[PDB]
Enzyme design. Structure first.
Site, PDB file in Angstrom:
ATOM      1  N   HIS A  71       2.889  -0.079  -1.474  1.00 34.74           N
ATOM      2  CA  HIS A  71       1.933  -1.187  -1.363  1.00 34.74           C
ATOM      3  C   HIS A  71       2.512  -2.355  -0.547  1.00 34.74           C
ATOM      4  O   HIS A  71       2.692  -3.477  -1.027  1.00 34.74           O
ATOM      5  CB  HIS A  71       1.484  -1.625  -2.760  1.00 34.74           C
ATOM      6  CG  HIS A  71       0.602  -0.619  -3.438  1.00 34.74           C
ATOM      7  ND1 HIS A  71       1.048   0.197  -4.449  1.00 34.74           N
ATOM      8  CD2 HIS A  71      -0.683  -0.249  -3.194  1.00 34.74           C
ATOM      9  CE1 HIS A  71       0.068   1.000  -4.832  1.00 34.74           C
ATOM     10  NE2 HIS A  71      -0.988   0.761  -4.073  1.00 34.74           N
ATOM     11  N   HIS A  75       0.776  -0.007   4.498  1.00 29.37           N
ATOM     12  CA  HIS A  75      -0.449   0.414   3.808  1.00 29.37           C
ATOM     13  C   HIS A  75      -1.641  -0.462   4.193  1.00 29.37           C
ATOM     14  O   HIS A  75      -2.748   0.041   4.396  1.00 29.37           O
ATOM     15  CB  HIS A  75      -0.236   0.379   2.291  1.00 29.37           C
ATOM     16  CG  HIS A  75      -1.485   0.591   1.481  1.00 29.37           C
ATOM     17  ND1 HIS A  75      -2.230   1.752   1.538  1.00 29.37           N
ATOM     18  CD2 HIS A  75      -2.114  -0.212   0.591  1.00 29.37           C
ATOM     19  CE1 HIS A  75      -3.267   1.651   0.722  1.00 29.37           C
ATOM     20  NE2 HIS A  75      -3.208   0.476   0.120  1.00 29.37           N
ATOM     21  N   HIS A 111      -6.471  -6.646   0.974  1.00 34.67           N
ATOM     22  CA  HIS A 111      -6.889  -6.041  -0.287  1.00 34.67           C
ATOM     23  C   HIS A 111      -5.732  -5.752  -1.261  1.00 34.67           C
ATOM     24  O   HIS A 111      -5.991  -5.617  -2.462  1.00 34.67           O
ATOM     25  CB  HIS A 111      -7.686  -4.767   0.001  1.00 34.67           C
ATOM     26  CG  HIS A 111      -6.836  -3.550   0.125  1.00 34.67           C
ATOM     27  ND1 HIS A 111      -6.190  -3.216   1.292  1.00 34.67           N
ATOM     28  CD2 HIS A 111      -6.511  -2.591  -0.774  1.00 34.67           C
ATOM     29  CE1 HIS A 111      -5.489  -2.110   1.107  1.00 34.67           C
ATOM     30  NE2 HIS A 111      -5.672  -1.708  -0.134  1.00 34.67           N
ATOM     31  N   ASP A 112      -4.466  -5.686  -0.795  1.00 35.07           N
ATOM     32  CA  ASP A 112      -3.316  -5.501  -1.686  1.00 35.07           C
ATOM     33  C   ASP A 112      -2.243  -6.585  -1.522  1.00 35.07           C
ATOM     34  O   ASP A 112      -1.088  -6.355  -1.900  1.00 35.07           O
ATOM     35  CB  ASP A 112      -2.664  -4.130  -1.463  1.00 35.07           C
ATOM     36  CG  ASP A 112      -3.287  -3.017  -2.299  1.00 35.07           C
ATOM     37  OD1 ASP A 112      -3.875  -3.284  -3.374  1.00 35.07           O
ATOM     38  OD2 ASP A 112      -3.176  -1.857  -1.864  1.00 35.07           O
ATOM     39  N   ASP A 229      -8.828   3.291   1.391  1.00 31.86           N
ATOM     40  CA  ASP A 229      -7.713   3.120   0.462  1.00 31.86           C
ATOM     41  C   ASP A 229      -7.196   4.474  -0.012  1.00 31.86           C
ATOM     42  O   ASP A 229      -5.982   4.682  -0.144  1.00 31.86           O
ATOM     43  CB  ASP A 229      -8.177   2.262  -0.725  1.00 31.86           C
ATOM     44  CG  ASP A 229      -7.021   1.599  -1.495  1.00 31.86           C
ATOM     45  OD1 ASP A 229      -5.873   1.464  -1.000  1.00 31.86           O
ATOM     46  OD2 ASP A 229      -7.286   1.170  -2.615  1.00 31.86           O
ATOM     47  N   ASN A 232      -5.080   8.736   2.474  1.00 26.33           N
ATOM     48  CA  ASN A 232      -3.816   9.382   2.831  1.00 26.33           C
ATOM     49  C   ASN A 232      -3.921  10.902   2.892  1.00 26.33           C
ATOM     50  O   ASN A 232      -3.434  11.489   3.873  1.00 26.33           O
ATOM     51  CB  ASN A 232      -2.684   9.027   1.852  1.00 26.33           C
ATOM     52  CG  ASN A 232      -2.331   7.554   1.816  1.00 26.33           C
ATOM     53  OD1 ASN A 232      -1.707   7.127   0.856  1.00 26.33           O
ATOM     54  ND2 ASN A 232      -2.735   6.766   2.842  1.00 26.33           N
ATOM     55  N   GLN A 280      -0.120  16.057  -6.435  1.00 26.86           N
ATOM     56  CA  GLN A 280      -0.948  15.846  -5.257  1.00 26.86           C
ATOM     57  C   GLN A 280      -2.167  16.755  -5.300  1.00 26.86           C
ATOM     58  O   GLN A 280      -3.275  16.327  -4.944  1.00 26.86           O
ATOM     59  CB  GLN A 280      -0.144  16.064  -3.970  1.00 26.86           C
ATOM     60  CG  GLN A 280       0.813  14.927  -3.640  1.00 26.86           C
ATOM     61  CD  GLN A 280       0.100  13.598  -3.573  1.00 26.86           C
ATOM     62  OE1 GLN A 280      -0.851  13.429  -2.806  1.00 26.86           O
ATOM     63  NE2 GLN A 280       0.539  12.651  -4.383  1.00 26.86           N
ATOM     64  N   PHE A 283      -4.511  15.244  -7.765  1.00 22.51           N
ATOM     65  CA  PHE A 283      -5.008  14.006  -7.177  1.00 22.51           C
ATOM     66  C   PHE A 283      -6.181  14.282  -6.232  1.00 22.51           C
ATOM     67  O   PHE A 283      -7.232  13.643  -6.329  1.00 22.51           O
ATOM     68  CB  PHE A 283      -3.834  13.310  -6.466  1.00 22.51           C
ATOM     69  CG  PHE A 283      -4.187  12.022  -5.776  1.00 22.51           C
ATOM     70  CD1 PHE A 283      -4.919  11.045  -6.417  1.00 22.51           C
ATOM     71  CD2 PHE A 283      -3.740  11.783  -4.491  1.00 22.51           C
ATOM     72  CE1 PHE A 283      -5.237   9.855  -5.774  1.00 22.51           C
ATOM     73  CE2 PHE A 283      -4.042  10.601  -3.842  1.00 22.51           C
ATOM     74  CZ  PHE A 283      -4.784   9.630  -4.480  1.00 22.51           C
TER      75      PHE A 283
HETATM   76  O1  LIG Z   1      -3.448   2.266 -10.228  1.00 18.65           O
HETATM   77  C1  LIG Z   1      -3.384   2.684  -8.929  1.00 18.65           C
HETATM   78  C2  LIG Z   1      -3.890   1.878  -7.905  1.00 18.65           C
HETATM   79  C3  LIG Z   1      -3.800   2.292  -6.583  1.00 18.65           C
HETATM   80  C4  LIG Z   1      -3.221   3.521  -6.266  1.00 18.65           C
HETATM   81  C5  LIG Z   1      -3.046   4.320  -5.079  1.00 18.65           C
HETATM   82  C6  LIG Z   1      -2.529   5.504  -5.466  1.00 18.65           C
HETATM   83  C7  LIG Z   1      -2.089   6.705  -4.754  1.00 18.65           C
HETATM   84  C8  LIG Z   1      -1.994   6.718  -3.364  1.00 18.65           C
HETATM   85  C9  LIG Z   1      -1.464   7.811  -2.701  1.00 18.65           C
HETATM   86  C10 LIG Z   1      -1.050   8.917  -3.423  1.00 18.65           C
HETATM   87  O2  LIG Z   1      -0.531  10.083  -2.900  1.00 18.65           O
HETATM   88  C11 LIG Z   1      -0.363  10.286  -1.570  1.00 18.65           C
HETATM   89  F1  LIG Z   1      -1.634  10.324  -1.083  1.00 18.65           F
HETATM   90  F2  LIG Z   1       0.397   9.326  -0.981  1.00 18.65           F
HETATM   91  C12 LIG Z   1      -1.162   8.915  -4.819  1.00 18.65           C
HETATM   92  O3  LIG Z   1      -0.782  10.063  -5.458  1.00 18.65           O
HETATM   93  C13 LIG Z   1       0.263   9.963  -6.434  1.00 18.65           C
HETATM   94  C14 LIG Z   1      -0.240  10.577  -7.716  1.00 18.65           C
HETATM   95  C15 LIG Z   1       0.682  11.427  -8.508  1.00 18.65           C
HETATM   96  C16 LIG Z   1      -0.452  12.052  -7.776  1.00 18.65           C
HETATM   97  C17 LIG Z   1      -1.667   7.814  -5.470  1.00 18.65           C
HETATM   98  O4  LIG Z   1      -2.331   5.528  -6.845  1.00 18.65           O
HETATM   99  C18 LIG Z   1      -2.759   4.306  -7.312  1.00 18.65           C
HETATM  100  C19 LIG Z   1      -2.809   3.916  -8.637  1.00 18.65           C
HETATM  101 MG   LIG Z   2      -5.005  -2.159  -4.739  1.00 19.15          MG
HETATM  102 ZN   LIG Z   3      -4.546  -0.209  -1.568  1.00 15.19          ZN
END
Ligand SMILES: Oc1ccc2cc(-c3ccc(OC(F)F)c(OCC4CC4)c3)oc2c1
Ligand SMILES: [Mg+2]
Ligand SMILES: [Zn+2]
EC number: 3.1.4.53
Length: 322
Positions: A71, A75, A111-112, A229, A232, A280, A283
């Site tokens: 962050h 980003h 935003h961050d 946001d 990725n 991932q 996710f």
């Molecule tokens: O409370 C929050 C607020 C904002 C964000 C943003 C993210 C976030 C961004 C990129 C990620 O992975 C990759 F794309 F880089 C990601 O994955 C990690 C998770 C274990 C599987 C999470 O996670 C958050 C949690």
């Molecule tokens: Mg945020």
């Molecule tokens: Zn963000």
């Protein structure tokens, strides 16, 4: 010329944002914002002094933490540039005013800002001053907004100095609405509402999305920036992997603090029991693909290549677990 050659990719998904960060002297947010404002002719439309823009952008960029792994200012630039591409999608041509485009881009940039590299829940569980100020509700997102607006008041920083009073009031409200919607605890409700719009959407004679009230317009911008946001895993794989490296470092360091304090370690934050590849995959399956599929539905078929990359990236991470 190296940097300037790379900035010719600013309309493209998969810009090399990490090379721009290094080529620009850890100034990716300033130079990407400046380039996009030039490309969209925003400086002339809103009578923004060029020196005022650079001063604000540099101060804003300064208030992102250079010692936080994910962050940070990179980003922020990435989300700005991703939002910039999604604004240019054929299904949205001539839909949003110059003020709405300005709001969406500015929201993305701030935003961050001043993110400390720990989550809202961690700030709530540790009796932080931030959670005390904001009564446990969108703690970080309220904070990023207050910082982003406050910095406009610094010396030669008011990039909105030549907007009308009404334009500033409307821009201020839209930016707040957009950033509070990046609160990740709001994702399910935001997506549920997005599904509803896709089910009931209308198009015009020209083929473009029909948005005839503030509620629908702000909802599309809210989801657009939320998509950027969460973009990725939709990026070319070499970009995606480096974003995952950075988020996991940040998550691990939060879990080390939750370890040093006797707290239960948050999901995916324990570096002694963390399956990066499986996480991932989950996710994408539970968060990123349901959102991007719905966005792709809203703007069909404009986003088909972005969705194919997401499904390829998902297949690749999956393929590393057997
Ligand atoms: O409370 C929050 C607020 C904002 C964000 C943003 C993210 C976030 C961004 C990129 C990620 O992975 C990759 F794309 F880089 C990601 O994955 C990690 C998770 C274990 C599987 C999470 O996670 C958050 C949690
Ligand atoms: Mg945020
Ligand atoms: Zn963000």
């Amino acid at each position: 010329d190296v940097l300037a050659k790379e900035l010719e990719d600013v309309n493209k998904w998969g810009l090399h944002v990490f090379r721009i960060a290094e080529l620009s002297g850890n100034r990716p947010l300033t130079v990407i914002m400046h380039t996009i404002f030039q490309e969209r002719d925003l400086l002339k439309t809103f009578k923004i002094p060029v020196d005022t823009l650079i001063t604000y952008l540099m101060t804003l960029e300064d208030h992102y933490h250079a010692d936080v792994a994910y962050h940070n200012n990179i980003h922020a630039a990435d989300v700005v540039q991703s939002t910039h591409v999604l604004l240019s999608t054929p299904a949205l041509e001539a839909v949003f005013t110059d003020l709405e485009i300005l709001a969406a881009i500015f929201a993305s940039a701030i935003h961050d800002v001043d993110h400390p590299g720990v989550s809202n829940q961690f700030l709530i569980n540790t009796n932080s001053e931030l959670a005390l100020m904001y009564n446990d509700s969108s703690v970080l997102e309220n904070h990023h907004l207050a910082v982003g607006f406050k910095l406009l008041q610094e010396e030669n920083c008011d990039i909105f100095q030549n907007l009308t009073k009404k334009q500033r009031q409307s821009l201020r409200k839209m930016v707040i609405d957009i950033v509070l919607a990046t609160d990740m605890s709001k994702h399910m409700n935001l997506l549920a509402d997005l599904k509803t719009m896709v089910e009931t959407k209308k198009v015009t004679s020209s083929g473009v999305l029909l948005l005839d009230n503030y509620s629908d317009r702000i909802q599309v911008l809210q989801n657009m920036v939320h998509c950027a946001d969460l973009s990725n895993p939709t990026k070319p794989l070499q970009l995606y992997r480096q974003w995952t490296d950075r988020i996991m470092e940040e998550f691990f360091r939060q879990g080390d603090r939750e370890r040093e304090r006797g707290m239960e370690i948050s999901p995916m934050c324990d570096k002694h029991n963390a399956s990066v590849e499986k996480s991932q995959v989950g996710f994408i399956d539970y968060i990123v693909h349901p959102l991007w599929e719905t966005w792709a539905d809203l703007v069909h078929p404009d986003a088909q290549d972005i969705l194919d990359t997401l499904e390829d990236n998902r297949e690749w991470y999956q393929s590393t677990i057997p």
